[PDB]
Amino acid sequence: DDKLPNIVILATGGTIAGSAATGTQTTGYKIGALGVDTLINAVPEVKKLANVKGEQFSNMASQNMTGDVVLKLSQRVNELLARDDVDGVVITHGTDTVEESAYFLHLTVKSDKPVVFVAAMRPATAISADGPMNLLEAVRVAGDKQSRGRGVMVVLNDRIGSARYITKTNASTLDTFKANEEGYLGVIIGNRIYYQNRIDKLHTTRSVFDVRGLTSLPKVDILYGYQDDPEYLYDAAIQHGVKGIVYAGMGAGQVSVRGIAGMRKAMEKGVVVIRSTRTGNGIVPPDEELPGLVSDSLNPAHARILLMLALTRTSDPKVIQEYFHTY
Amino acid sequence: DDKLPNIVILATGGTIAGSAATGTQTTGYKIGALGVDTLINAVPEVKKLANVKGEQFSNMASQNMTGDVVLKLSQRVNELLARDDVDGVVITHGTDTVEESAYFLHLTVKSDKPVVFVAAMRPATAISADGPMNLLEAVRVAGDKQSRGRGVMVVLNDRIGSARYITKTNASTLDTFKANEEGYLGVIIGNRIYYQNRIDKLHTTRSVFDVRGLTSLPKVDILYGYQDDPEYLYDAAIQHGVKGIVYAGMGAGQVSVRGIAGMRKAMEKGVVVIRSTRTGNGIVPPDEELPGLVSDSLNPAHARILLMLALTRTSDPKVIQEYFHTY
Amino acid sequence: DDKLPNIVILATGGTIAGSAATGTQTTGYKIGALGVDTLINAVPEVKKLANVKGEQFSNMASQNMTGDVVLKLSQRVNELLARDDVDGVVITHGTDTVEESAYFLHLTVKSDKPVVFVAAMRPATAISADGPMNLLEAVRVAGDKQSRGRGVMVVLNDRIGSARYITKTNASTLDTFKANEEGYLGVIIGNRIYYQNRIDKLHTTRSVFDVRGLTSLPKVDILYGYQDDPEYLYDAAIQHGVKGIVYAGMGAGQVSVRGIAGMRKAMEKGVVVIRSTRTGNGIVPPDEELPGLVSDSLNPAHARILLMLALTRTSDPKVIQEYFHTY
Amino acid sequence: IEDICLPRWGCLWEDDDKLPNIVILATGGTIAGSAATGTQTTGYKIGALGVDTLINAVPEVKKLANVKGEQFSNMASQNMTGDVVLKLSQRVNELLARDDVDGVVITHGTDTVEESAYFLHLTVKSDKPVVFVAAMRPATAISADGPMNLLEAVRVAGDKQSRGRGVMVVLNDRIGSARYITKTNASTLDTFKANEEGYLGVIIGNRIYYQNRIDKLHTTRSVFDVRGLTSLPKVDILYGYQDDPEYLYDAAIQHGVKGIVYAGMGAGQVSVRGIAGMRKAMEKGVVVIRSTRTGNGIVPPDEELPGLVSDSLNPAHARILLMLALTRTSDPKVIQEYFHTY
Ligand SMILES: N[C@@H](CC(=O)O)C(=O)O
Ligand SMILES: N[C@@H](CC(=O)O)C(=O)O
Numbered sequence A, B, C: 001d002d003k004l005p006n007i008v009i010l011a012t013g014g015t016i017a018g019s020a021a022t023g024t025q026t027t028g029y030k031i032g033a034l035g036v037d038t039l040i041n042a043v044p045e046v047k048k049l050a051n052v053k054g055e056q057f058s059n060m061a062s063q064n065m066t067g068d069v070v071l072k073l074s075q076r077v078n079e080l081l082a083r084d085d086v087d088g089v090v091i092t093h094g095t096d097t098v099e100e101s102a103y104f105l106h107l108t109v110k111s112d113k114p115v116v117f118v119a120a121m122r123p124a125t126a127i128s129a130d131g132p133m134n135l136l137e138a139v140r141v142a143g144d145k146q147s148r149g150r151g152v153m154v155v156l157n158d159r160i161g162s163a164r165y166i167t168k169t170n171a172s173t174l175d176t177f178k179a180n181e182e183g184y185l186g187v188i189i190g191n192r193i194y195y196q197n198r199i200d201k202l203h204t205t206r207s208v209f210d211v212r213g214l215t216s217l218p219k220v221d222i223l224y225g226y227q228d229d230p231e232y233l234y235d236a237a238i239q240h241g242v243k244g245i246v247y248a249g250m251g252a253g254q255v256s257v258r259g260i261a262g263m264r265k266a267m268e269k270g271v272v273v274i275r276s277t278r279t280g281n282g283i284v285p286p287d288e289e290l291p292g293l294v295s296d297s298l299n300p301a302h303a304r305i306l307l308m309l310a311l312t313r314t315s316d317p318k319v320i321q322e323y324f325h326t327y
Numbered sequence D: 001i002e003d004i005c006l007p008r009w010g011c012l013w014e015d016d017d018k019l020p021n022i023v024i025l026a027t028g029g030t031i032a033g034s035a036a037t038g039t040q041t042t043g044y045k046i047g048a049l050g051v052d053t054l055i056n057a058v059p060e061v062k063k064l065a066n067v068k069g070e071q072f073s074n075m076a077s078q079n080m081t082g083d084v085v086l087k088l089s090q091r092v093n094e095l096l097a098r099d100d101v102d103g104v105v106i107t108h109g110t111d112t113v114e115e116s117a118y119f120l121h122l123t124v125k126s127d128k129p130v131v132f133v134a135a136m137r138p139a140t141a142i143s144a145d146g147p148m149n150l151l152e153a154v155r156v157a158g159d160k161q162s163r164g165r166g167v168m169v170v171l172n173d174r175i176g177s178a179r180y181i182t183k184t185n186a187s188t189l190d191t192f193k194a195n196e197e198g199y200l201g202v203i204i205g206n207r208i209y210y211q212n213r214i215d216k217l218h219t220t221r222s223v224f225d226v227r228g229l230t231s232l233p234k235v236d237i238l239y240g241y242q243d244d245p246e247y248l249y250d251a252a253i254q255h256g257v258k259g260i261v262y263a264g265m266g267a268g269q270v271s272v273r274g275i276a277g278m279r280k281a282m283e284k285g286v287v288v289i290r291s292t293r294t295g296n297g298i299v300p301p302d303e304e305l306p307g308l309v310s311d312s313l314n315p316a317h318a319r320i321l322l323m324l325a326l327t328r329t330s331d332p333k334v335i336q337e338y339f340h341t342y
């Protein structure tokens, strides 16, 4: 059908491809059993929105997704979007770390063609499974000419989230993906896309980051901030050769006497520290009296992705801080 | 005034007692400078709601609050509420770890008399500083007969939050304290309290946790869940003699192959592992195929407080799990 | 099965019983064709939670639900719950006016046995239809001993809302039912109920409202507040014999000079005016300088239901105002 | 920084040529509310407190901009009317056409700021910032929000990065688009939210963080031009609920409405009584927009129901767009397209 857009569904795994013995097992199920062609054939309506081709990239639970594999995913998506016969890509993924994978591609995909991550909170075998409609919506978004140049998108539950703002806010609910302060890029209601916002940040074709032919990324750990937080976790990260530490800080990236000592020690060894927040939302503002750089509105998981990519380009703290304010 | 309730304002510090040279310095200000009587004298209207007595317990930024000091704060509040001449206590505290301090007292205060934490996101010297109205509302709540038996409360921005549900959701905003799934116990509008909910959990006078005569707490650290999370941080926590690890997990407390190896090592050494969530909200459901216990709807910071108190009474994982479902 | 609770599924219609020719059709689906037994047979797992009996009360779209029919629904539920062989009732209903029907039964059901409204945003024939899981959850809640004495409940999307607080917040999304300030009474995750709150309001067995003998209810209309709102709509309501007007006011029930003239004319004719808010949330506080009574945190649709019932018990404005603060 | 006001001339711009020139155009609201005590948060006076008193309460504003106050009105916003909003739009267009004006901050009541702001969003023919500001507590309250909201509004209006964003509403450290922002709570400081669309930006630690640009037509790309108008079409809003009466449609028709916005049950759904009323209105040439009472989200098209659909416009916003649509057209296809694009 020469009228329809050509969409690759690049499958990585996740609960959307999860399988249990009964419709009420929504916890305990298997990931690794359902191939992309089985997902496509379960929603043949997708074939009215696009010419779809399935490609099996991986079949893992996203809690096991690693930077080396995300780097390969970015490289594969770039190869697909460089082709004239590909109009967009839908990536099926686990909900747990989709925000990390999506934000990585948001910074590194060198195309305006749509890249739409899709996931499901209930396994494919569940009663009222959300994956079928999420996939149909993701294909609609990936295939729409109006979807171009918006950055990487995450589509669940009738919502289109920017990779830069969207986060899994709830352990277990269908409506978990929200950006409380930034909203959705758009919504899909009655089989129509309603675009609301364009993000005011650099991404994709206007991003400086290009990691095509890297094979590995700088090591970055995330340490939590809390009452009685110990210095020894900084020491352990330093001893294992981290290049960056993201701090999931108390309030606005605020630091105890232990965190301060740990950050100062790490920076003396050339580790870059980003102060983010454990709160879930909002701005960590600059404070020249505290060590490290600040995460802007990046949450810890997003901040780690940006810091890893920043460290491939520079060790200059002024340049890295500007990336945190612009990406 | 024999008609008015007797309320002790027990000051611990925080931005509510923060001081800067200008009204627009909302970052960089000093905590440790402003005493409880200066806070009281800035809102003399409080003296129409109650007979207030200030007591200076500490004067620190709450990112420096520690379990030994929270233990002493619980002990002091228990001794104040045991007195016939005290009808309730307001505790001024920093926003960054108020949810940790408040939840600890929620579990350990053996009185139905109101205990109301209050804080401010802007320093006392700021333009449109929030601390004055927060304090007046906190005194109104602490003094109201209808406030008894509700568990420990956190009052900011016209809202009354339960210590068990309320969390700082935003690094930097006035409206940061929310319980997205559980709502507020009540609101204060037009100088009137509107009670909405009673928490359906054990607390205060129905809690088994009694720490009168304890001098220290079990060591519990929090490790974050993310792509490429390292096993070596579990090794470090084990080597430093932690009694508990709270895991700020991916999604519903989900664990990488590295986290699973770390948790299995910890449990072999007698460490109790609680799987919570980094997401900010919702339920980590039981899963007998994964290591450790589950945090129910307790976020990581709250889960650490309950685990520390649980470990003062038991090492039995069945009892600790039941505490996580009932407190 | 003598172990299982006896639950009646009392069907009234709604999108949960909507049927279309294709899985993607969102408009011109049919309500009125799909019987309660077809809903039950689509989720046979419900038979493992309860002994279910289907009863067809009606089969309409809830935008067509009327006070005369809600009155009969209340009467039928009271008749069912008076029976020893009924442990609870699930009521299938349209989403559009479930908050009006549910709040009416919340005030008029004279039993502590659970009454659980359930609904679906997608038709039964839709891809990823929500009705099956919503119904299974509603039966789990209605059958649980812990669910007794909580007031009337609305269950969708893994959430249990109080009839007094829950509202349809979004025209079109699955997660539409929320109580932004009051939260959910509980959630259902992994086939387990997590109760969070008990509402701090009068309902059911502690309510003064009893309609078992009534055959009609007082007339109450709702007028909107907005720039240039016309006096003539007050005149029209008065000429058509309303006994009450609920005002969906600007901000905190605020009134233009035209609305004030209309309200004064209505009150001169014995019409009771309740000032609610168009905003969606929060308290309309008392103000003796404005006409009428205030809705507390009741939104316009809920305020109308309470005013209709209040008018069966009193014409005293002091008593009606107290009802708005206590129900 | 000293107000220099000369005779038979008026007040001068501070010389500071580094700073933007910002007009603070005052209309009233609780931000200009005054009571006898700090705890009177209902019962206070609006109409007594002038724009220079607001400016003098936050002299820090003079470090962000050269500010000139202009008193446009001094009313509670529940009394704001389309004829006054029309004049406000025309005055803002006159100010922004001047080379010596870099932006305008408009002080207003919270209750109908979303209506006034959206009207100007469609009718202001400039990329220069227009920032509505309001306060939920009176100027005399303990922890009054108006001072910081005004300082934030001036910072936004003066920033070169603020241009071309549409009309903005600034309270409580947030920058909302006029098209999405609404008063969501009767009484709270954090009432202004756009649950599905978020904020355009936030102001934290004296810095603006821009997050979003709205993907809708506004200001310099809007077809709505009301310069030269002295009158606007009549549009009423009717609520949808169980037992909603047909007679309120009859009353609106008899009073010559050109439009009806329906605050519908769920997705603009209509009872048999509402359908009969809407059919009667449309037979008389009244344009009907089906919006939602819910507070959020999309009313989708449905050829089987009467009227047009509001898209994601809430009833108050839908009334403003319908009134402006009816200045230019009665074509339902054109009006529907406006609802999808504005
Ligand atoms: N653990 C699963 C969760 C999900 O997809 O919902 C994953 O992220 O792969
Ligand atoms: N760092 C401060 C922040 C605040 O109180 O707002 C504290 O927690 O003490």
Ligand SMILES: N[C@@H](CC(=O)O)C(=O)O
Pocket (backbone or CB within 6 Å): C013, C014, C015, C016, C031, C060, C061, C062, C063, C093, C094, C095, C096, C097, C119, C120, C121, C122, D266, D269
């Ligand atoms: N119009 C339908 C909508 C739904 O149930 O979702 C009804 O309320 O009956």
Ligand SMILES: N[C@@H](CC(=O)O)C(=O)O
Pocket (backbone or CB within 6 Å): C251, C254, D028, D029, D030, D031, D046, D075, D076, D077, D078, D108, D109, D110, D111, D112, D134, D135, D136, D137
């Ligand atoms: N009634 C006031 C309320 C406020 O400004 O907060 C107004 O809209 O003018």
